[PDB]
């Protein structure tokens, strides 16, 4: 089940892939709108992988433990420059999550993308599968690969400020290590890249 995803010069092989999970649309497809008057310009270089640790995942953590990750997040790359140079901006995310572990470990993650969450009520977690999602079972895959189009009330999300997508990872079942190999902690990384970025309304350079 090998799968190799490249964006820009960056690549990401994975041999435990269970397949891409498209959310809400088979493919992101921008169309020009009245609101930018055609001044918008696509930028090739923004579309690259960048990665960040989410959490160590121990057996100590019970059901329903959450780890949200607001997107876009602050970043040192070109994408983090465009939030400073250009005001209005548009992108559709492509996200991997990886929780490498011995297959003798037992447990499961529910990684999912929630559009525009302000808060997530305690009762509400069971419903979380309505959102685009995949499961991380150590006995099977160690890699999830969600892919979503830009979503929002506005065709161009304001730079910074509003965050359309948030990457939530829930501990669907507690980790178990009956082999007692330790193991123990299982680090969970994410490997995220923008797709089909567009920018409009350049603003004066800092300072």
């Amino acid at each position: 089940r090998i799968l190799t995803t490249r964006h820009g010069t960056t690549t990401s092989t994975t041999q435990s892939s269970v397949g891409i999970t498209y959310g809400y649309a088979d493919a992101d497809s921008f169309r020009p709108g009245p609101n930018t008057s055609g001044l918008e310009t696509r930028v090739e270089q923004a579309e690259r992988f960048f990665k960040e640790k989410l959490f160590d995942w121990t057996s100590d953590k019970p059901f329903g433990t959450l780890y949200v990750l607001e997107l876009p997040k602050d970043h040192k790359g070109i994408y983090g420059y465009l939030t400073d140079a250009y005001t209005y901006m548009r992108n559709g995310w492509d996200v991997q999550v990886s929780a490498t572990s011995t297959q003798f470990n037992g447990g499961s993650l529910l990684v999912a993308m929630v559009p525009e969450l302000c808060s997530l009520k305690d009762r509400e977690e069971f419903q979380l599968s309505l959102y685009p999602h995949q499961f991380i079972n150590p006995r099977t895959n160690t890699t999830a690969h969600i892919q979503v189009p830009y979503l929002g009330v506005n065709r161009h999300d304001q730079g910074k400020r509003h965050q359309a997508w948030s990457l939530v990872v829930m501990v669907l079942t507690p980790l178990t290590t009956e082999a007692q190999m330790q193991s123990g902690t299982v680090e969970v990384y994410a490997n995220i890249a923008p797709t089909n970025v567009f920018v409009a309304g350049e603003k004066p350079a800092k300072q």
Binding site: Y24, A25, R31, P32, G33
Partner: protein, 47 residues
């Protein structure tokens, strides 16, 4: 369309009764998602 219906038709012009839509030129998902389902039994069915 929706919970509306009459043998006749609305007295006022469509321009007055409802906001007009505009194409992006000078869609449904969960139907397709539900139709993507594989009810076919996995493995070698027998008997």
């Amino acid at each position: 369309s929706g919970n509306t219906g009459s043998i006749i038709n609305n007295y006022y012009m469509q321009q007055y009764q409802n906001s007009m839509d505009t194409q992006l030129g000078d869609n449904d998902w969960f139907s397709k998602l539900a139709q993507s389902a594989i009810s076919g039994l996995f493995g070698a069915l027998l008997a």
